Structure formats: structure tokens, C-alpha cells
Design a protein around this ligand. Structure first.
Ligand SMILES: *Cc1c(COP(=O)(O)O)cnc(C)c1O
Ligand SMILES: *Cc1c(COP(=O)(O)O)cnc(C)c1O
Lengths: 402, 402
């Protein structure tokens, strides 16, 4: 079945030394390492198939245009969209959410309306809605957290009303690892006539995602967290909404100095300038690589690795964990009264890469009354030995610093 | 001493066959091929140095952050900016111009003002200004063309008045190869208190560019036309202007659900989300590669190649050329009454890649009373033998089709 030894052999960076020690990279939630299959797919495109892709007549350009559109089709099958034309290539999740907030938001949210977010959102799924509610005179409502890191689902009937136009909600928390009950939340939102955008940047690498089963109206994720290149992400929009969305800024179609400007049809309408064809080719290879391993195989390995880490972390004195027992992907923690950045600095000195800080989720930190947390990511190429290095390191820090 | 043979050996795509014949890639103005040094720099980053850059403290993240900031410094020296912090990493020229129009334009162009562009502008340097003039109620004024493809410089003094806020002008036309007299135009604009944005997307690969000597207020170009990766470009803004530009839509600094949002300072203010670190590393390698060849050496070789091409094209019956005698980089043409797309399709049969259509410059096409043109690019890796194949192919099409 799944062999972590064979998976690790695909990732050249895992041989790196840091501070003279073999790297234990526990920060895939910030960005994932890339297998050779992804790196080489992008390089081979540049070495042998590169051209511009904007309606070029010559053979190299026509073949490159086909490669790009085949990646759009592969991505649409990956999330089980009904049509490839429901997918927009964006620069990343941040840009995809802002695109919805401006194109769809400015045309559908008006004075007196409200938008619902949650207290656990990444800043990228808060600020565009704060700005939009400021542009039009709408109200931003917030689903509160429970101490265990889940959302208070029972507050949703009170927060929704006939003026709620959109729920913007994370699939999986980037700090807590919480997987939100999207199917139930989407059912409730649609009864009030609201749309639902799902921030899926921390979900698509952990298990299969089916946007038709979810029935979400928008879904966004980032290529670089899905073992792929930087500078590329995917925005999915239901065709009925996407074909109605007005232009934002293969996007400009015609220009006249006397008659004005027209724009191309969606999804190309929202892909201005020159595509990041290199990143698109690499992203396609990342989807092929993940699919070849099998997302259910990945989910089982990662779930068993998480269970091992949580059981082992019970032997660390004065450790505080944040989030639910059934967390996906990440473990958020603090050690005693020590500053998160000090804990992170000692772990780095032991060759272990974790992330410390507010993790672009300051309202979440405020809820737990801390300035920062440490966060360890446990991805499909991580091992028991790396978990053991984390646990023994935390025990070592507690012994030395009290 | 420039050797085209030594240069061509660095570009693996040039060994490609198209339609069974050795490739003659005459479309670098659409997008440039990349040397192995650029492809490998990006791949080596992914293989051995990859991490997130958003102020991560662990060793790999700190090192990746330093690599990105070293590229910003290298790019600032490449265009002779005063400070590396005058440069913003943008997705491309299209996005860079829109950034200026939305942050600077919305704060400096008001009802009753005017903006001046030219009739030869790329759509990306037209539409942002058309839409801004509609958001605020300003007038868009246009420098007309001459038959030889130069701008009517003598009309500028009457187009400028005390209400002119900005001149947006191309350094080198992407269709005609006209190099505009920026020194005179910038001197005139500044006498009226206007700022100047220069679209330099077709200039920076052909000769040295010095933004202090030009004294332009904004300068923008694209990485993929400068032998670099897709998905990355550069926006230069004078420091005094850049630090006054407000945010539009590391960019988010702090988020509070009760107190609102703050943003980072420029240039980072205008780099939202996750940087395209792969493309930045490759862009750095492209600047190194070009600087090692020498832009004055590149300019000399390309000018002699252009002179040879224009002399040889005189032997083609029914050939119409568009543009001035001292064109840079590109030759725009049509053959008899034949459709440009048909000419390009036949050349593609001979293994020759040219671009056809309106080249994102429909007002230019309308001036010449044609729907489209063919465009051959003559870059630093092109040769006399490729020119000869273009000439022979055009002669063949004229013989076959009339
Ligand atoms: C990383 C992340 C984002 C931002 O994604 P970018 O690709 O950096 O724009 C948004 N939401 C979540 C949950 C994330 O983990
Ligand atoms: C290519 C080009 C643009 C657009 O640049 P992108 O990287 O595609 O955004 C704008 N202006 C000129 C003159 C160009 O040649």
C-alpha cells in the first residue's frame, strides 16, 4: 500500500542538513516540499515545450495552450467539478478569495446585508469581507469558537437571516486542524438564499474533496501547499454564478479608443495578463502525483501518524495543545510559559522546522488569550522518527528552561 | 565578444523540431525562451532550499527569505534604481500597471483631470486608464501616430495642461519596435507637474535601462520576456511616491474583528499572499545571465541582425512593413492581401514561429487600417540563417498563393 520510504525518496529536499543536523521539516502547512516529478515536469516544459499561450497560431504555442487546458481539466476532475470551465487559475488562495469578494461581492452585497465568517479564519478569508462590508455598508458576523477548537454550530441559525448573502468558511483550520461540518453549514446557508465560499487551502492534500457533494458555490486552494509550485492556485465557481460574474480589472478582449472595452468569457475572463504556465504545468504534475499515491491512502497514513504523535506528546510536561482530538494535519501547542519563538528557536537548533507566531489567524489567538502558538505539520512524507525528535526536543527544552 | 553560437547552446528549446523541421523561434516578443541557467536555478531552489518565506524563523525559511530579498536588490541594480525598496514584485506588467492605476491613480486623479496615453499602447497600458477616467470623471487623451510608426511628438505640448496628472507611455512598441523619445516626453510632463509611467516590457532585454537617468516615476516590465520564468514581473516606483501610495485590495499586517486591519509598508505592502519564490529565484538567474552577456553586446548583435533582416526582406514581393527604420526587436509586416493568420500558418509549416493577430494593440491596427499583422521577433539567440528561412518562406507563400 502506502510506503513512506518510497514517498520520501521522491523529495530531494529531505536530505538537507540544517544547523549540521538532518532536517525534520514539520512546516508543510506553511508550504509543502515538492517531489522530483513536479520539479522536473516544470523544468521539462521550459526545456522542450515553452511558448506563449494566448491564441498563438504556431505549433509550440498551440501545444502549450493545450497543456494548460488539460491541467484545468485534470484539476476539475480532482475536485469533481461538473465542468473544466468552472475552474479559474488564480495566483493563490488569497487572490482567489479577493476575486470573489470584488467581482461577485460588489454585485451581490448591498447596504443593510450581512456576511458570515468564523473566528478561526485565516486573514485571507477575513480582510476581503471586512473591506467589502466597508465598501457597501454591510455587516460582518462571526461564528464563535468552542474551547476545543470547533465552531459553535448552534449559533448559525441566529446568525443567518434573509439579509445574509454569503458564508465564508474554512474547510480545515490552518492552526487547529479542525475540519468544519461543511455539508450541514451549506444546507443551512442555502435555505436562507446565501452562497458559501469554502477556503480549502488546508484540505485538498489530506483526503478527497468533492465540490458536487459539498454543493459549495465557491471553493479555493493553493498549489504550493499541495506539493506544487508557487504562484498558482485554483478557484472553483458554480457555472451558474461564474457566468454571471462581472469583470474585475486573456481577460481583455477588444479595446477601442472611441467605443470602450470588452472582456473575454469566464473562466478566462478572470485570468488577466500572461498565465503562469510554468506553475500550471507543475501543478498538473502535483495532482497526478497525489492521485497516483491515492488520497485515501494518504489520509490513512497521515491519520495514523497523527495518532502516534498525539499519544507520544502526552509525555511532555507542561504542554498545552489547542484544537480537537480528530485534528487533520497540524498540531498547535505552547510549552509552559515559554515564548513560542523561543521554543521554535530551540527546535530549529535541533534540526526541526516548526512555525511559531500568529499563523495569519490573530482572532484565533485572541480567542485563546495567547499572542502566538507553535505549530507542527505532519504530512505524508513525515515519519515516526521525526515525531520522536519533536517529542524528545520538547522534553529537552522543558528540562533545560524549566 | 558576443557569440550567438555560445548563447544558443544555453537554450535547450532551440534544438526542438516543429512539424518535423528545425525550429526557427521568431516569437520572443510574445515570450522569450529560457537558458538552462534560469531553468536550473528554479529547480535547484525547489530541490534543495525550499521553504515558506513569510517571516518564518527556522533556518530554511530565513534562508529563502534572504534569497528573495537578494533578487530584489539585483533587480534594482539592473535598472539602476536608487534603492531596492523601490521595487515591487508583481505578477507581470499587466498587474503592475493596474496596481499603479488603482493605488496611485484613485488617490491622484480626480474629476476634471486628464491622463495621456499613446495610440501605440498595449491594451494593458490602455484599459486601466480608461476605467480610472470613468471612476473619477477624467479625460483620456491620446498621442497620435505618424505613418512611419513614430508618435507625433509635436502634439504633446497641446495635450498637456495643468490638469494632466499622468503620462502612461511605452518604452518600445510590442508591434512596431519603435523606441519612444522618453527623455523629451518626461521633461515635458514634469514641467506640467504630471507623473510618467513607462511600460518597459519590450525594452529591458534589448539595451541598458537606467531609471535615474530617465527620471521616470513608474517603470514596469515582465520576467517572461526577459528570458525568465512566467508569473513574475517588476514594478519600479520612485521612493517618495511609493511610500505615499495607499493599499487597495506580506501585505496584511494585523487583523482584529473589533479594530479592523493594518497593512505592511511598501514595497511589501503591494505583495499580497505568498510570493512566487520559484519565479523570483529564476528571475534573479535571468538578470545574472543577461548581465554576464552584456546588454551593450546584446544590443550590438541584435541591431546588426535587424539590419540584415530588413535588407534581405527587400527581396520579398508584395511585402508591407510597418514601423520606423530604427526599429528594435520586432518586424511587423503583412504579405499582399493575404490574411496574417494564413501567412503565419504557412510559416509554421516550415518550422518558423511568428505571431499574428492584433498583438493586444487594436488601436494601432485601426490606425493602419488593417485587422492584423504578422510579427517576427529577432532576439539575441536568433541567427542570419533563421532570417534567411523567413525570407525564403515568404517568397514561397507569395509564389503559392499569389
Ligand atoms: C495558506 C492559507 C491561505 C492563503 O493561501 P496563499 O496561497 O498564501 O494565498 C488561506 N487560507 C488558509 C486556510 C491557508 O492555510
Ligand atoms: C507583453 C507586454 C505587456 C503585458 O505584459 P504581461 O507580462 O503579459 O502582463 C504590456 N506591454 C507591453 C509593451 C508588452 O510587450
Amino acid at each position: 500500500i502506502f510506503s513512506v520510504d518510497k514517498v520520501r525518496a521522491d523529495f530531494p529536499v529531505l536530505s538537507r542538513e540544517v544547523n549540521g543536523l538532518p532536517l525534520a521539516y514539520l512546516d508543510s502547512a506553511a508550504s509543502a516540499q515538492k517531489p522530483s516529478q513536479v520539479i522536473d515536469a516544470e523544468a521539462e516544459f521550459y526545456r522542450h515545450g515553452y511558448a506563449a499561450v494566448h491564441r498563438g497560431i504556431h505549433t509550440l504555442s498551440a501545444q502549450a495552450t493545450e497543456k494548460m487546458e488539460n491541467v484545468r481539466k485534470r484539476a476539475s476532475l480532482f475536485i469533481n467539478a461538473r465542468s473544466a470551465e468552472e475552474l479559474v487559475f488564480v495566483r493563490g488562495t488569497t487572490e482567489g478569495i479577493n476575486l470573489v469578494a470584488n467581482s461577485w461581492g460588489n454585485s451581490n452585497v448591498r447596504a443593510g446585508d450581512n456576511i458570515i465568517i468564523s473566528q478561526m479564519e485565516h486573514h485571507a478569508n477575513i480582510v476581503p469581507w471586512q473591506m467589502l462590508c466597508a465598501r457597501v455598508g454591510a455587516e460582518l458576523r462571526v461564528i464563535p469558537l468552542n474551547p476545543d477548537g470547533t465552531l459553535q454550530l448552534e449559533t448559525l441559525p441566529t446568525l443567518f437571516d434573509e439579509k445574509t448573502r454569503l458564508l465564508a468558511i474554512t474547510h480545515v483550520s490552518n492552526v487547529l486542524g479542525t475540519e468544519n461540518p461543511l455539508a450541514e453549514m451549506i444546507t443551512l446557508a442555502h435555505q436562507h438564499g446565501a452562497k458559501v465560499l469554502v477556503d480549502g487551502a488546508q484540505a485538498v492534500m489530506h483526503h478527497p474533496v468533492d465540490v458536487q457533494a459539498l454543493d459549495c458555490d465557491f471553493y479555493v486552494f493553493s498549489g504550493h501547499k499541495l506539493y506544487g509550485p508557487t504562484g498558482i492556485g485554483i478557484l472553483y465557481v458554480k457555472e451558474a454564478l461564474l457566468q454571471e460574474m462581472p469583470p474585475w480589472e486573456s481577460m481583455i478582449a477588444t479595446v477601442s479608443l472611441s467605443e470602450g472595452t470588452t472582456w473575454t468569457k469566464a473562466p478566462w475572463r478572470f485570468e488577466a495578463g500572461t498565465p503562469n504556465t510554468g506553475g500550471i504545468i507543475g501543478l498538473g504534475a502535483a495532482l497526478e502525483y497525489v492521485s497516483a499515491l491515492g488520497l485515501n491512502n494518504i489520509a490513512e497514513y497521515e491519520q495514523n501518524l497523527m495518532h502516534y504523535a498525539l499519544s507520544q506528546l502526552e509525555s511532555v510536561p507542561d504542554l498545552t495543545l489547542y484544537g480537537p482530538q480528530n485534528r487533520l494535519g497540524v498540531i498547535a501547542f505552547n510549552l509552559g510559559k515559554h515564548h513560542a519563538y523561543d521554543v521554535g528557536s530551540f527546535l530549529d537548533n535541533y534540526g526541526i522546522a516548526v512555525r511559531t507566531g500568529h499563523h495569519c489567524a490573530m482572532p484565533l489567538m485572541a480567542y485563546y488569550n495567547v499572542p502566538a502558538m507553535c505549530r507542527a505539520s505532519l504530512a505524508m512524507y513525515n515519519t515516526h522518527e521525526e515525531v520522536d525528535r519533536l517529542v524528545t526536543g520538547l522534553q529537552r527544552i522543558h528540562r533545560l528552561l524549566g
